[PDB]
């Protein structure tokens, strides 16, 4: 009955899946994968993800991988309204913004979250060089989000969709560091992020970390 | 009035859309964008793509950007069979592989295409180091594609889907480098490519280049 989500809760890619599963109201549980013992590279795991990585989802005998693919499925199966399937124009927007998150927002955030967050916990120091330039890249993205959110309640339009939830796992991480002050320069992105932060699904996900 | 695909035929992100538009029998028209004139950063283009990039698609009054989203749109609008909409398990399978193209296949192929094809065109030289390194990363993906293609007729199952088509533009470019031979060690992957190559849709985009 419950779908098994494979991966350690410390990965923001698995929590991207947890966000959608929590919102669609899916029956699921997490199964941690230890990287220390190369568990992700075991034969049992390779039948779930041939590329040997997490996340991986199992629904009965159905195996899925790639966080964003796992996300569309949980909505597609439990809360399709998050995909606006049925309305062509609306569904097109959700896709447009699901791609922007991956190719724009997160792409600028990734270098940052590592320097400011992962690197130090592994015993390293933060490279300001990298942080500074990526903050510029992200800055230009937030200006667009700012205009977008001035005209629309949410990213895909006046409704919540997968485009929105897909941004929480990385943003929650950003919000745990002193760089959360970059959102203050964009009132609408800020308001938007607060609205999302109220949702129980988001609070649970934040709790998983 | 035909759809408008904005951008130069030269970019494979642009032609990725053409492949989808072609196969869906979409009535479209290519509208070049000259970067030399910062035309992509013109206020006119900024209405089509807030990020000032190509491709951008116009359908009457609808405006879409980000290639893989434009692709889903044309398929959903003119050929929903490519998405396998009505089958939860099949649609999920399509999504998984649409991500694999972007996150594994083209992730390894892009660096090589820039070095071998773009760099020299601009007036530079190919850095073999990055060609060999990414060539290694690619083989690891190919051996998994090989395994998949033995079990299934196509990537998402025994049916052609957008997942397959989305690999057209970049692979087409690979077949324009001395590296097109890598596929020879991967029989099912090679057969799969040859099967696709015989479609008029891929023959039309190849012509566009």
């Amino acid at each position: 009955a419950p779908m098994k989500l494979y991966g350690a809760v410390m990965s923001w890619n698995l929590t991207r899946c947890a966000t959608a599963l929590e919102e669609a109201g899916s029956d699921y549980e997490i199964v941690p994968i230890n990287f220390a013992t190369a568990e992700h590279k075991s034969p049992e795991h390779l039948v779930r993800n041939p590329f040997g990585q997490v996340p991986a989802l199992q629904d009965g005998d159905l195996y899925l991988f790639e966080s964003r693919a796992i996300c569309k499925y949980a909505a597609r199966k439990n809360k399709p309204e998050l995909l606006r399937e049925g309305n062509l124009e609306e569904a097109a927007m959700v896709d447009v913004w699901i791609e922007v998150e991956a190719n724009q927002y997160t792409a600028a955030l990734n270098p940052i979250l590592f320097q400011v967050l992962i690197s130090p916990m592994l015993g390293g120091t933060t490279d300001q060089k990298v942080v500074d330039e990526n903050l510029e890249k992200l800055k230009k993205v937030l200006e667009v989000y700012e205009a977008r959110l001035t005209k629309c309640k949410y990213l895909a339009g006046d409704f919540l969709s997968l485009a929105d939830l897909n941004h929480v796992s990385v943003t929650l991480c950003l919000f745990a560091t002193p760089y959360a002050s970059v959102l203050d320069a964009y009132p609408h992105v800020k308001a938007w992020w607060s609205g999302l932060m109220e949702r129980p699904s988001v609070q649970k996900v934040a709790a998983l970390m």
Side-chain angles (χ1 to χ4, degrees), chain A residues 52-90:
Chain A
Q53 57 192 194
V54 297
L57 186 94
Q58 179 187 357
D59 198 0
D61 65 286
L62 180 65
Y63 279 116
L64 298 166
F65 52 102
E66 276 294 334
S67 60
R68 299 163 189 90
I70 296 170
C71 299
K72 302 188 191 66
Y73 176 79
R76 197 192 285 290
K77 167 195 177 69
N78 286 168
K79 210 183 178 198
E81 298 73 37
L82 288 169
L83 262 5
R84 308 305 280 201
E85 292 293 15
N87 193 303
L88 186 67
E89 304 271 276
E90 290 189 328

Side-chain angles (χ1 to χ4, degrees), chain A residues 105 108-109 111-117 120 126-136 138-139 142 170-186 190 193:
Chain A
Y105 189 89
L109 254 183
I112 299 178
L113 300 192
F114 168 66
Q115 295 298 320
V116 166
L117 204 65
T126 305
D127 189 1
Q128 199 69 25
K129 304 177 179 187
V130 178
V131 173
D132 287 347
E133 66 173 79
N134 279 113
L135 268 174
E136 292 222 47
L138 179 60
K139 199 178 308 310
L142 292 174
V170 289
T171 310
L172 271 179
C173 283
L174 173 66
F175 222 60
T177 75
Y179 290 97
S181 53
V182 75
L183 303 175
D184 288 306
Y186 308 96
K190 176 81 280 295
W193 175 235

Side-chain angles (χ1 to χ4, degrees), chain A residues 123-198:
Chain A
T125 52
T126 305
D127 189 1
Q128 199 69 25
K129 304 177 179 187
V130 178
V131 173
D132 287 347
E133 66 173 79
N134 279 113
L135 268 174
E136 292 222 47
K137 300 177 183 168
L138 179 60
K139 199 178 308 310
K140 321 315 166 189
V141 176
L142 292 174
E143 284 182 35
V144 172
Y145 274 52
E146 180 56 20
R148 177 60 184 172
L149 296 165
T150 290
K151 312 165 192 181
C152 285
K153 198 182 183 182
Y154 292 98
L155 260 9
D158 285 341
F159 45 83
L160 181 78
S161 63
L162 246 191
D164 302 274
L165 296 330
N166 277 11
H167 288 89
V168 322
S169 62
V170 289
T171 310
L172 271 179
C173 283
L174 173 66
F175 222 60
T177 75
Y179 290 97
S181 53
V182 75
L183 303 175
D184 288 306
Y186 308 96
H188 292 105
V189 180
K190 176 81 280 295
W192 167 73
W193 175 235
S194 309
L196 289 175
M197 251 175 92
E198 300 182 349

Side-chain angles (χ1 to χ4, degrees), chain A residues 11-119:
Chain A
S11 157
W12 56 73
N13 285 112
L14 331 180
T15 53
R16 185 171 300 118
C17 302
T19 310
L21 289 158
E22 289 294 340
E23 188 68 50
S26 303
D27 203 1
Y28 85 99
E29 60 181 65
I30 312 181
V31 174
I33 299 289
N34 189 6
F35 282 162
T37 55
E39 207 180 310
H40 64 302
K41 295 307 194 294
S42 61
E44 303 105 51
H45 196 251
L46 294 166
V47 302
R48 309 175 195 130
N49 193 346
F51 295 100
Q53 57 192 194
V54 297
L57 186 94
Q58 179 187 357
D59 198 0
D61 65 286
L62 180 65
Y63 279 116
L64 298 166
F65 52 102
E66 276 294 334
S67 60
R68 299 163 189 90
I70 296 170
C71 299
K72 302 188 191 66
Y73 176 79
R76 197 192 285 290
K77 167 195 177 69
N78 286 168
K79 210 183 178 198
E81 298 73 37
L82 288 169
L83 262 5
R84 308 305 280 201
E85 292 293 15
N87 193 303
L88 186 67
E89 304 271 276
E90 290 189 328
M93 293 304 301
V94 176
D95 293 354
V96 168
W97 292 85
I98 278 178
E99 287 297 297
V100 173
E101 173 260 309
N103 313 136
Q104 221 69 48
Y105 189 89
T106 304
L109 254 183
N110 227 97
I112 299 178
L113 300 192
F114 168 66
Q115 295 298 320
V116 166
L117 204 65
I118 316 303
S119 177

